[PDB]
Design a protein around this ligand. Structure first.
Ligand code: BCB
Ligand code: BCB
Ligand code: BCB
Ligand code: BPB
Ligand code: BPB
Ligand code: MQ7
Ligand code: HEC
Ligand code: HEC
Ligand code: HEC
Ligand code: HEC
Ligand code: NS5
Ligand code: LDA
Ligand code: LDA
Ligand code: LDA
Ligand code: FE
Lengths: 332, 258, 323, 273
């Protein structure tokens, strides 16, 4: 039922506004240990010889690197993505330039994607950056991905019960609830807000009185839109292991300035970045993946806030490999 | 343009705000607080002598009289002239206007302070169809004690000083609400009956504890006019008697608990 | 201590009284039975029940409404009875999700909701004239019915009057345990934080005061039970020491006091004002105010606070930001 | 000065401390020792309010706010401008409330009536302590308590609630709200009933206890009776805070997640998961 004291608390607003984080030490310790498994950086190698664009035969992304640098990248990629499977997960044993295995081509675009993240989305990932480990956590299928319909469990490393299985229709309401921090909110915030940029998440007017021309009948957005973004926010809060107060002063959810924290701005950029990643990198991969990876509508697994953050306000408590692997961004 | 906007920085909701406060204070001040004055008004002073004309504020604070037509004949109009006739045996502790009064004689018999009774009607409260509402079980023979509860008839009454003071002979019941309100008891050693409100009764299986008064004080419990019915004033007289005991039964009960 | 205020020590039994009404005396059904444990903290007699035309009209319409809700709920768990019990609080009947304006919504998107709403409304109207007519049959004032009318009016406000005034059924309250709860945040979020709606404040003020008054009144009557203060009707018509002492308790405490009758007017008025104030608030919401916080800022009422972490410009308004 | 029936009750005695020394009235007000302490604490309190407010930005009653310290000061004294005023005012409030309650027992003893009212008044004093004292003790800072401002205290209720994503799902809250609603209802019903019996109107005659119970039996099949509705009323009102207190104290010290998630104990039973 309950969690024993004490509680660690933080302050995020003026004294008296009851704004901050309320964390259970046990839980933070568990998440810290889980994230500490992040493999250390491989030793640096000194750049010798020609670029690998002139030695190997099929390198299009990492051609700038020397041979020792490049091979260091490959063992890091293996450590982060397919530690248990090894090099052969992406390669033919006797033709390292063969693209015959689907992980090879995906890995190529994953390289372009994570380089893109560390260059174009610094407004969100800052100096920390992301590596393949950030999402994959040492397996080829990342533990926390989303389809166009909600699935349980959130961690696809756990085995589903019969009700949790997506084809069992009696368990839809529960699949949806566990995505929105257990609320009865009847909206899937991922397909509404994170899969593409079609929908606006802001819903509350920026004037005291209702503007004539947007305020009556079919001119009005339905109230469901307000439910929907509540759901998205519940889901965001859960994905980072935090509450509304981390980003908002509930006195006015719609206001910035003194009514918001810098983390709200960063979260704003995170929405934009997740939309880019889904629309332009992860969603088109249904052409390149086997049918066992796709969802029930031929969709590839896509990313949300949880994919990186996994219940922590910074992914892996801020661990970074950025300076250790320049090849992964930012690129001038 | 804006729904609800009015000329020069007014809007509808701002007006309703003012309206709502006005409505509230109107009901509270002009209606409720005057209803509150249907008893005990007009107030009394160190003799308000202006006998020729009334002072203006005493007319303004009162509502127009209302008349209740009572169910078994009669009317009552409130507010009305209702001064306390009875000689109160109290004396002024000091000259200050709000200083307390001291009892001059024996405050239980003299019915002052917590032993005071209201001057209610000397009539018996009636059932919906005219019968006496509060009657003892010798009369109300279709009423019983409920299966499971102590039957107090026979049990002794122990007063505050641990002394057996009498024997419960009967229970008086409310025939309108099906609720026992008094026990009748014989006062040992004086060959009279006395009523006790159940609220002063700790009902045990072997005795009835009564901490409000001493054993000797059961002698002067007000007597009823009749054996088998009681009037509203008598109910006040009886109930007030024990309540007086909470403060007066011993000298030590009036002084500070610490 | 007066133990009679805690529970009845010696219960009484006696023949069941029936007060004759101007009509419907034959429509009382059932035989009274008595509960001993109930009788320790109340009146032991349960039943009989009056059973007029309106009472049945109410049960008819209410059960229709309940059935419409329950079958839609069951449809949400594809009729699995075990998941139905497990997920019951999360299941609901929702108003239209899409904007149809005032158009009658498709059954799969709020038509069923609309119809449950009609049949509940009819049930409330039927029960209302039951509450009213019973009072006149027994020759009593219509005080309760008017208090109850305010309660029904408030439900109509959140259920359909407010949707009508802004012109979208999508703003109705869903049926369901958690779903009707979720609406409160969705509504408050849409309209700029209900803490800044003065009529919310009024409602709360009266709702809390109902706590204050009933605690105060209940405690007062119990403190004067020894003098019969529970027999409040005859203490109105013939002031006894009970209400004398009750009035002097308060007069010496707060400087003024009521009568035994007027405290009931106070309480009746406060409970009424919870629903009247709530109704004004909803009627003004959406129709004439869009964001209650900005309305309070517009009129200089909102408090403000220094930044703690740095003030944060809305990134959407920085030059060259994505949409 | 005096109600027509008042003078016979206005006798000496029933005090808890001081005997005759403070046993007197001033206008209608009984004083007693706890009247004196009440006024003391009130004076001290509203003085400290006024000093604190003048050192602040505005004088608009809606926007004044005396706030507790930052969390970093834990349970120590804070500088007076940055939480000290709030600490002093809280003590003065508790002085005033407890004085007020004890004043009421004295008045009760003098009239020879039950102490039910000061008793009932303990539960809001208790609930105030849950919010300003006990819950900040358990969390370790005074800064978790709420600020003294007409509107600023709502901003604290607001954010506090949203610290747990949807406070409506708090089971202590669910209980508390349900008592708040049914208590308001019952007071309507009770007051409505009493007036309907004494005020049928049209010159028709006043009715009777039997009529009271007959009405409720007829409409809902049961009538709890005259005395009991008052006992139930005090019970219903009091349980608004008595149960809500648990939901408040749980939030933070015994639960750090969102309140909807708490219902996993039910939803996630393996037998139907
Ligand atoms: C856990 C949640 C709480 C809460 C949540 C809350 C909400 C959501 C709302 C209020 C509202 C109110 N609250 Mg608040 N509150 C208040 C007082 C108030 C009033 C400003 C107002 C209406 C009160 C009312 O009618 O009650 C019934 C009592 C009655 C009717 C008797 C009359 C009371 C009188 C109006 C009290 C006025 C107090 C003075 C303004 C302050 C004292 C001044 C000093 C200098 C003497 C006090 C004095 C306290 C204390 C000491 O604990 C308190 C604690 C709480 N409130 C907790 C923090 N309260 C409403 C409001 O409109 O605020 C802007 C409102 O919407
Ligand atoms: C995050 C969102 C919040 C919110 C959202 C909210 C909304 C949207 C509305 C309120 C409203 C109200 N809020 Mg508020 N609120 C309140 C208190 C209150 C109430 C006093 C007031 C009136 C509601 C009511 O009494 O209905 C109880 C009574 C009801 C519902 C009447 C029922 C009567 C009916 C005849 C019963 C019949 C039922 C049938 C027997 C069953 C049949 C059904 C079957 C057939 C299906 C407090 C004390 C607090 C605190 C301490 O924080 C708070 C905070 C919040 N409110 C947050 C700001 N609140 C209302 C209001 O006043 O707005 C101005 C309102 O519309
Ligand atoms: C977004 C956040 C919300 C929220 C957050 C919230 C929190 C954080 C807490 C509550 C609490 C409560 N909420 Mg809730 N809330 C409530 C209702 C309630 C109350 C029943 C309950 C108790 C309030 C209290 O503790 O008073 C406190 C009152 C006090 C202390 C009275 C002090 C009186 C004092 C002794 C004397 C004061 C005297 C004056 C100074 C003297 C001056 C007078 C003049 C005349 C001289 C309703 C009906 C709703 C609706 C309709 O949605 C709602 C929604 C919300 N609540 C939103 C979801 N609410 C409390 C609770 O019990 O939670 C389980 C609570 O801690
Ligand atoms: C401030 C003002 C308050 C207020 C005031 C008032 N509220 C009143 C009156 C006043 C004045 C009435 O006189 C009337 C009544 O009748 O009281 C005895 C009534 C009502 N307020 C009810 C519920 C409620 N008030 C709520 C709120 C507020 N109200 C606000 C807070 C809430 C909240 C908070 O959500 C709820 C859920 C119902 C009990 C009742 C209507 C039944 C109905 O409309 O039929 C609906 C038809 C049905 C078939 C539903 C059947 C089930 C229900 C529970 C009814 C079962 C009763 C049945 C007779 C049991 C028999 C068993 C027997 C054999 C042993
Ligand atoms: C379930 C229990 C219910 C309940 C019960 C009962 N309620 C009672 C009794 C019972 C039994 C009485 O016997 C007593 C009384 O006499 O009745 C007239 C009383 C009373 N209920 C009052 C207020 C009340 N009841 C509330 C709630 C409930 N009550 C709940 C619902 C609420 C809210 C917020 O809901 C309020 C505001 C006062 C009017 C009165 C105390 C006067 C006092 O104490 O004098 C002494 C104090 C003063 C005159 C002022 C002191 C100023 C200090 C020093 C400085 C101010 C500091 C302050 C903290 C600043 C806050 C700022 C603010 C904006 C945040
Ligand atoms: C100046 C100085 C040194 C003075 C010394 C003496 C001294 C200590 C004075 C105190 C001065 C102070 C602090 C005064 C403030 C008084 C206060 C706190 C007033 C608050 C009043 C408020 C807002 C009350 C809210 C409750 C409310 C709406 C009550 C209205 C109706 C009333 C009066 C109910 C009380 C009441 C109830 C509850 C009954 O049940 C009952 C039953 C039968 C007869 C009468 C009554 C009755 O009067
Ligand atoms: C998928 C997650 C991979 C794992 C695990 C390993 N490799 Fe790899 N490799 C991968 C890609 C997508 C590419 C193309 C790179 C580009 O910039 O386009 C490569 C390339 C190589 C090469 C260059 C050979 C050539 O194309 O001629 C070599 C020599 C190579 N990889 C070796 C290698 C080893 C030794 C690995 C285990 C330590 C290993 N790779 C793992 C994808 C993936
Ligand atoms: C989150 C923003 C990611 C980062 C950073 C990287 N990957 Fe990824 N990858 C991600 C998703 C959501 C998916 C879809 C699920 C899936 O299993 O396809 C993938 C997929 C892959 C694959 C295909 C594996 C398979 O389907 O069996 C490979 C080989 C892969 N990813 C490799 C890879 C590398 C090498 C990365 C760093 C250069 C990398 N990914 C980053 C999410 C994310
Ligand atoms: C940061 C990691 C956040 C947390 C935790 C919560 N919210 Fe949020 N919210 C955030 C952003 C960046 C935005 C703007 C998104 C955009 O694309 O513009 C929002 C928006 C809202 C809104 C809408 C405000 C508007 O202008 O219409 C609401 C009502 C809202 N957020 C509420 C809310 C609640 C209740 C939360 C706790 C459950 C919460 N948010 C958490 C960032 C973050
Ligand atoms: C991997 C590509 C990510 C995804 C998807 C999301 N976030 Fe993220 N976030 C990521 C990194 C590497 C960092 C850097 C940590 C640092 O030290 O700056 C962040 C940071 C945040 C923060 C800042 C937290 C703080 O304590 O300052 C927030 C509030 C945040 N991220 C929110 C957020 C949301 C709401 C997302 C889904 C829209 C999201 N992030 C996705 C990496 C990734
Ligand atoms: C012109 C025509 C077509 C349109 C007008 C129709 C009209 C007047 C519609 C009105 C609709 C209205 C008033 C809607 C209001 C809906 C509201 C306030 C719903 C609120 C709450 C609903 C709840 C809590 C329902 C929950 C449902 C259940 C628990 C399942 C039902 C079973 C029960 C036993 C109900 C018990 C409820 C409770 C006592 C436990
Ligand atoms: C609980 C919310 C209460 C908010 C109170 C805000 C009232 C605003 C109206 C103020 C009067 C108008 N004016 C002209 C002074 O600005
Ligand atoms: C916010 C709700 C407003 C409730 C208003 C109730 C206030 C009662 C005021 C009592 C007035 C007493 N007196 C003697 C001055 O008239
Ligand atoms: C303008 C807002 C007023 C809020 C309600 C205040 C209640 C007033 C009670 C004070 C009256 C005290 N008095 C004089 C009756 O003893
Ligand atoms: Fe009463």
């Amino acid at each position: 039922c309950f969690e024993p004291p004490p509680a660690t608390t933080t302050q995020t607003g003026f004294r008296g506004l009851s704004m901050g984080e309320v964390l259970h030490p046990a839980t933070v310790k568990a998440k810290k240990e889980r994230d500490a498994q992040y493999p250390p950086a491989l030793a640096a190698v000194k750049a010798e010889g020609p670029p690998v664009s002139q030695v190997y035969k099929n390198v299009k992304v990492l051609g700038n690197l020397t041979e020792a640098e490049f091979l260091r990248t490959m063992t890091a990629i293996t450590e982060w993505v397919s530690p248990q499977e090894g090099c052969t997960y992406c390669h033919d044993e006797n033709n390292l330039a063969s693209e015959a295995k689907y992980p090879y081509v995906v890995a190529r675009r994953m390289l372009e994607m994570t380089r893109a993240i560390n260059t174009n989305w610094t407004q969100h990932v800052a100096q920390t950056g992301v590596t393949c480990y950030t999402c994959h956590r040492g397996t080829p299928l990342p533990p926390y991905v989303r389809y166009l319909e909600p699935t349980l469990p959130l961690n696809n490393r756990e085995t589903p019960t019969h009700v949790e299985r997506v084809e069992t229709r009696s368990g839809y309401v529960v699949r949806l609830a566990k995505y929105t921090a257990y609320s009865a909110l009847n909206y899937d915030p991922f397909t509404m807000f994170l899969a593409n940029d079609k929908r606006q998440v802001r819903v509350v007017p920026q004037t005291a009185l209702p503007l004539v021309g947007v305020s009556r009948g079919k001119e009005r957005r339905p109230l469901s839109d307000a439910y929907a973004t509540f759901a998205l926010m519940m889901s965001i809060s859960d994905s980072l292991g935090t509450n509304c107060t981390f980003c908002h002063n509930a006195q006015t959810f719609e206001s910035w300035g003194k009514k918001s924290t810098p983390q709200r701005a960063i979260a704003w950029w995170g929405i934009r970045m997740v939309r880019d990643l889904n629309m332009n990198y992860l969603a088109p991969l249904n052409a390149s993946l086997p049918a066992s990876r796709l969802g029930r509508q031929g969709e590839a697994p896509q990313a949300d806030c949880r994919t990186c953050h996994q219940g922590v306000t910074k992914p892996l408590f801020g661990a970074s490999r950025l300076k250790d692997y320049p090849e992964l961004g930012p690129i001038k | 343009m804006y729904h609800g906007a009015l000329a020069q920085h007014l809007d509808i909701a701002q007006l309703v705000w003012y309206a709502q406060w006005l409505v509230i204070w109107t009901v509270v001040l002009l209606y409720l607080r005057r209803e509150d004055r249907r008893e005990g008004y007009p107030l009394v002073e160190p003799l308000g002598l202006v006998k020729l004309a009334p002072e203006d504020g005493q007319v303004y604070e009162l509502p127009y009289p209302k008349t209740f037509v009572l169910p078994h004949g009669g009317t009552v109009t409130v507010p009305r002239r209702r001064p306390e006739t009875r000689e109160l045996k109290l004396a002024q502790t000091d000259g200050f206007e709000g200083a307390p009064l001291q009892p001059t004689g024996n405050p239980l018999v003299d019915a002052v302070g917590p032993a005071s009774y209201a001057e209610r009607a000397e009539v018996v409260d009636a059932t919906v169809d005219g019968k006496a509402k509060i009657v003892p079980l010798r009369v109300a023979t279709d009423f019983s004690i409920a299966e499971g509860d102590v039957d107090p008839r026979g049990l002794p009454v122990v007063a505050a000083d641990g002394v057996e003071a009498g024997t419960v002979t009967d229970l008086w019941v409310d025939r309108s609400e099906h609720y026992f309100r008094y026990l009748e008891l014989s006062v040992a050693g004086s060959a009279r009956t006395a009523l006790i409100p159940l609220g002063f009764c700790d009902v045990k299986k072997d005795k009835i504890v009564v901490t409000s008064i001493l054993s000797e004080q059961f002698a002067n419990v007000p007597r009823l006019q009749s054996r088998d019915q009681i009037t509203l004033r008598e109910e006040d007289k009886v109930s007030a008697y024990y309540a007086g005991g909470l403060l007066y039964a011993t000298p030590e009960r009036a002084e500070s608990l610490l | 201590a007066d133990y009679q205020t805690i529970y009845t020590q010696i219960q009484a039994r006696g023949p069941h009284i029936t007060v004759s009404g101007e009509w419907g005396d034959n429509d009382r059904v059932g035989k009274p039975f008595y509960s001993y444990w109930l009788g320790k903290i109340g009146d032991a007699q349960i039943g009989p029940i009056y059973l007029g035309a309106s009472g049945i009209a109410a049960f008819a319409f209410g059960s229709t409404a309940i059935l419409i809700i329950l079958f839609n709920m069951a449809a949400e768990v594809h009729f699995d009875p075990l998941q139905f019990f497990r997920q019951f609080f999360w299941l609901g009947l929702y108003p239209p999700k899409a904007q149809y304006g005032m158009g009658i919504p498709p059954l799969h998107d709020g038509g069923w909701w609309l119809m449950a709403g009609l049949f509940m409304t009819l049930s409330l109207g039927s029960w209302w004239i039951r509450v009213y007519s019973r009072a006149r049959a027994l020759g009593l004032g219509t005080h309760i019915a008017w208090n109850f009318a305010a309660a029904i009016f408030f439900v109509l406000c959140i259920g359909c009057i407010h949707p009508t005034l802004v012109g979208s059924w999508s703003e109705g309250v869903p049926f369901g345990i958690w779903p009707h709860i979720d609406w409160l945040t969705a509504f408050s979020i849409r309209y700029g934080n209900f803490y800044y709606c003065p009529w919310h404040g009024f409602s709360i003020g009266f709702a809390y005061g109902c706590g204050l008054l009933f605690a105060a009144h209940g405690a007062t009557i119990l403190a004067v039970a020894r003098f019969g203060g529970d027999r409040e009707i005859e203490q109105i018509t013939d002031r006894g020491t009970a209400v004398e002492r009750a009035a002097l308790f308060w007069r010496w405490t707060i400087g003024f006091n009521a009568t035994i009758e007027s405290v009931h007017r106070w309480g009746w008025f406060f409970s009424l004002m919870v629903m009247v104030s709530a109704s004004v608030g909803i009627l003004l919401t959406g129709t004439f105010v869009d964001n209650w916080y900005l309305w309070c800022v517009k009129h200089g009422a909102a408090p403000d606070y220094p930044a703690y972490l740095p003030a944060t410009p809305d990134p959407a308004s920085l030059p060259g930001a994505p949409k | 000065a005096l109600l027509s029936f008042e003078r016979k009750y206005r006798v000496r005695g029933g005090t808890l401390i001081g005997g005759d020394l403070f046993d007197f009235w001033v206008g209608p007000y009984f004083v007693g020792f706890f009247g004196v302490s009440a006024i003391f604490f009130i004076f001290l309190g509203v003085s400290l309010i006024g000093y604190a407010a003048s050192q602040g930005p505005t004088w608009d009653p809606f926007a004044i706010s005396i706030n507790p310290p930052d969390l970093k000061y834990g349970l120590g004294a804070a500088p007076l401008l940055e939480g000290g005023f709030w600490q002093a005012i809280t003590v003065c409030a508790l002085g005033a409330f407890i004085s007020w309650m004890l004043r009421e027992v004295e008045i009760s003893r003098k009239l020879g009536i039950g102490w039910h009212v000061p008793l009932a008044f303990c539960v809001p004093i208790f609930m105030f302590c849950v919010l300003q004292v006990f819950r900040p003790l358990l969390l370790g800072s005074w800064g978790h308590a709420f600020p003294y401002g007409i509107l600023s205290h709502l901003d604290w209720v607001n954010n506090f609630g949203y610290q747990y994503l949807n406070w409506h799902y708090n089971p202590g809250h669910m209980s508390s709200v349900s008592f708040l609603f049914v208590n308001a209802m019952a007071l309507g019903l009770h007051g409505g009933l009493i007036l309907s019996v004494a005020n049928p109107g049209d010159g028709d005659k006043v009715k009777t206890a039997e009529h009271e119970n007959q009405y409720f039996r007829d409409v809902v099949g049961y009538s709890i009776g005259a005395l009991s509705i008052h006992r139930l009323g005090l019970f219903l009102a009091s349980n608004i805070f008595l149960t809500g207190a648990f939901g408040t104290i749980a939030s933070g010290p015994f639960w750090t997640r969102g309140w909807p998630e708490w219902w996993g104990w039910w939803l996630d039973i393996p037998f139907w998961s």
